[PDB]
Ligand binder design. Structure first.
Ligand code: NI
Ligand code: NI
Lengths: 259, 259
């Protein structure tokens, strides 16, 4: 009865990027049923789109809980809307727990506008320096901890110790970043409480874009997220202290949930 | 191009039992592609059925590797064959890494015949007794370690310590069992190296059936696997040192993989 899609966000090819389930509903279903569906899919997130008169309500669930924001699964939901629901629509508005989110389709690229957040350089305490599991060139701070490494090779070589990273309670996630070989810059994002590496992270680019824009002297850049799956992020510094984050999406599976 | 199904095995209702992906192919695809598909699904196993002239080849992949046996995903594959491929076929033969497997559909129950394996009573060493995290009434040994608890409540109350259970290297899995409140007997199965509790385990019933058959004086019994999802297993002692293990299956999602 409900249309269901598995989509790879920020992916140039199948099995890359950040995978999400996307469930498109004609009518409301209980939040407890959305949670059971997300647990059954066992994908990092299942997005639920309620198509109503004049608007889309969007919720996201991990296999364990409802969450209030998810940029990468929002890109997957916009891909589903413009490819199957309102074929070739350019502007997709979603009403969520965190307010209205807009996604713009530009060719086959999905664009999201986020606040520009230049991080601040900090000095780690001797104890914090022993928890990061590397010797960075510089350390920056925002919602996440940003570790500047000396090369793309050092970013690739890093092996997270989640037990140690969980002790860095001042930050949500741990970012490692460096200049890229094939791209302007690269990064990897670690989720210590989830014991996992995020395949592709849009919101880290709120910090990474102003930081690399200043270092490289560029307003338009390409970034790679060097996770196992890997992601490509189109980056642009906009006028009013905002940044544009864009990515491609790929369809893995199209079906129906029998409820 | 390939039909894809998500099925709950040993489940009387959706979101119960042991979930599996089932991919039905007209032609062979590379083993590396089957692995990528299993990793993309992120389900405990994805079963791949190759329908050829006169036979079915069956393989199973976890999100990490190909495996050589999987009774619960085999039940899901048989459910898919008899409900969608060869509608209402009663006998399903599969050719696998571990030889030929037969599944019989009896109404909506799927039957699998396994060897009867009466386990042997053992005495744990003081060190092993400290690793099991309980004080059992009796201890039995086979491929898995079997811990007889004093009630269904004690089975429900048990909370596995996988770090401690991983130190019991003499056994594959750790089984806790007791007489049931609503069923003849109950069990929970722990996979220490997988850091997980198995939702429903068919092969543990190779030991549990002869053991409870002798204790209860019954040839036909019903068992429950008291995992979070939960499973119901129809049990029967057969004539030639074999046992019959049966379960229901439920369809969660039907779709197509775009490859
Ligand atoms: Ni995320
Ligand atoms: Ni199994």
């Amino acid at each position: 009865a409900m249309e269901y899609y598995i989509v790879d966000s920020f992916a140039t090819k199948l099995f890359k990027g950040n995978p999400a389930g996307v469930c498109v509903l004609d009518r409301r279903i209980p939040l407890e049923l959305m949670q059971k569906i997300a647990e059954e899919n066992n994908l990092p997130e299942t997005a639920f789109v309620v198509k109503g008169k004049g608007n889309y309500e969007l919720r996201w669930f991990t296999p364990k809980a409802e969450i209030d924001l998810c940029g990468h699964a929002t890109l997957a939901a916009a891909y589903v809307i413009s490819n199957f629901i309102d074929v070739n629509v350019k502007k997709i508005d979603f009403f969520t727990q965190s307010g209205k989110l807009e996604v713009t389709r530009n060719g086959n690229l999905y664009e999201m506008i986020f606040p520009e957040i230049m991080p601040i350089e900090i000095e780690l305490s001797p104890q914090q320096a022993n928890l990061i599991g590397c010797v960075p060139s510089d350390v920056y701070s925002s919602r996440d901890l940003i570790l500047l490494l000396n090369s793309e090779q050092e970013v690739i070589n890093y092996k997270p110790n989640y037990a140690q990273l969980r002790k860095l309670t001042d930050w949500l996630g741990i970012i490692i970043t460096a200049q890229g070989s094939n791209t302007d810059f690269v990064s990897r994002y670690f989720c210590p409480e989830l014991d996992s590496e995020d395949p592709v992270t849009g919101s880290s680019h709120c910090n990474l874009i102003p930081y690399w824009s200043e270092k490289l002297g560029k307003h338009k850049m390409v970034a790679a997220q060097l996770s196992n799956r890997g992601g490509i992020i189109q980056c642009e510094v906009l006028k009013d202290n905002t940044v544009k984050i864009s990515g491609e999406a790929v369809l893995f599976m199209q079906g129906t949930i029998k409820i």
